[PDB]
Design a protein around this ligand. Sequence first.
Ligand code: HEM
Ligand SMILES: CC[C@H]1OC(=O)[C@H](C)[C@@H](O)[C@H](C)[C@@H](O)[C@@H](C)C[C@@H](C)C(=O)[C@H](C)[C@@H](O)[C@H]1C
Length: 397
Amino acid sequence: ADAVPAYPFSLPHALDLDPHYAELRRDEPVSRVRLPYGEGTAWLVTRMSDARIVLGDSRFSTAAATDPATPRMFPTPPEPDGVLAQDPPDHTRLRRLVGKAFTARRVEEMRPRVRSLVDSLLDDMVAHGSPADLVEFLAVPFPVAVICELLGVPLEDRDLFRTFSDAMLSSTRLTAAEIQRVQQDFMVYMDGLVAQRRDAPTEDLLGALALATDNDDHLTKGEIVNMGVYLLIAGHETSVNQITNLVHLLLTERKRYESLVADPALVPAAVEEMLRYTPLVSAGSFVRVATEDVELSTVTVRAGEPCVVHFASANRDEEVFDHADELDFHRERNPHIAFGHGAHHCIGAQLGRLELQEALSALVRRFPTLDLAEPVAGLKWKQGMLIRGLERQIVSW
Ligand code: HEM
Ligand SMILES: CC[C@H]1OC(=O)[C@H](C)[C@@H](O)[C@H](C)[C@@H](O)[C@@H](C)C[C@@H](C)C(=O)[C@H](C)[C@@H](O)[C@H]1C
């Protein structure tokens, strides 16, 4: 006895936006939806101004969305000791565990390591010679290397935590039980890695996490260990996919790649523009519940009513960006929310920006002749995961 549309609206194609988003933005920017898991209905938010209220305002709570009955985009009910499920000021204390490491200053200190590493992998890829798989030689091994040195994870457990991570970024691919099983193995594995540091500490985040275990009376082991897991998932899954998406946008209208080849200083502003353009999050968002009535553009969201944001739709608001439907690397202003907004703003924002910058610059400088060497129609996009990206990107040069 309800007539609210199912969200997501459709199964996704490549990085293509469902057109209902541009319709919704014009005519019904705040609309009711039935999310694929949990009970009941949620407001979908599709415009920037509203997005910033749902993400920004203290009267939207993510902790409140831990209730199993709360609508959600993913099978498992969310982990209460997860970062995304903390409201400030508890969220601020947790963010502070690890925050020092990810400041724009420290991340910039990594450009040299990160550059000599991208360089090394691009070597192995010219050893093997054209044509090769950009995913095998750059997209997976580069982000995986950086997060492992940063965290202090053994680069040799890659297949183990990659497996764990693909499962936990499941939308429709795996079931609640498949996923809760993987979670407990990850918890226990990550809990194991921090204990290795009990009588032998390390100069790496896992070190910091170990220290917080017996030297912080306000943070729980749940919270501390989950930070290891979430950093480790997010710290490679986002960048890996997001390199394949950037390369895909550039090579499909080769024009774009050629613009960067001429001026490898446009790379930073094109990363920011392609961060705006790309729906890396396939649909929805970690859900926020109103704790008090809150005024969005067209509706007062009531205390108890869930909302969910679509980052990529807010990034195509024509009130905020001139010619939003079009890729333009010479925009003067680009106030995108590809990295979210408010309390939960990406902690890796600066690292991901560095990782993409160094990946693209390198390609655009050493491989002028880079094209796709498989058809645009046969491209193996990852299916049934909360995030989009290619499983293989065979390139020629
Ligand atoms: C291109 C790279 C990346 C993109 C596009 C991206 C995108 C996003 C977005 C949109 C959010 C906001 C979620 C929300 O409030 O609902 C987010 C949060 C997050 N990002 Fe990323 N991300 C990237 C790289 C990274 C990296 C490298 C890490 C870790 C090293 C990371 C860790 C996270 C974490 C932990 C959060 C949640 C923090 C919190 O709850 O306060 N991300 N990311
Ligand atoms: C609804 C889709 C969202 O996924 C979720 O909420 C997931 C259940 C989270 O537990 C995932 C697995 C965590 O690792 C995140 C910290 C990863 C980080 C990159 C993001 O926050 C990301 C934008 C995320 O919010 C969305 C993909």
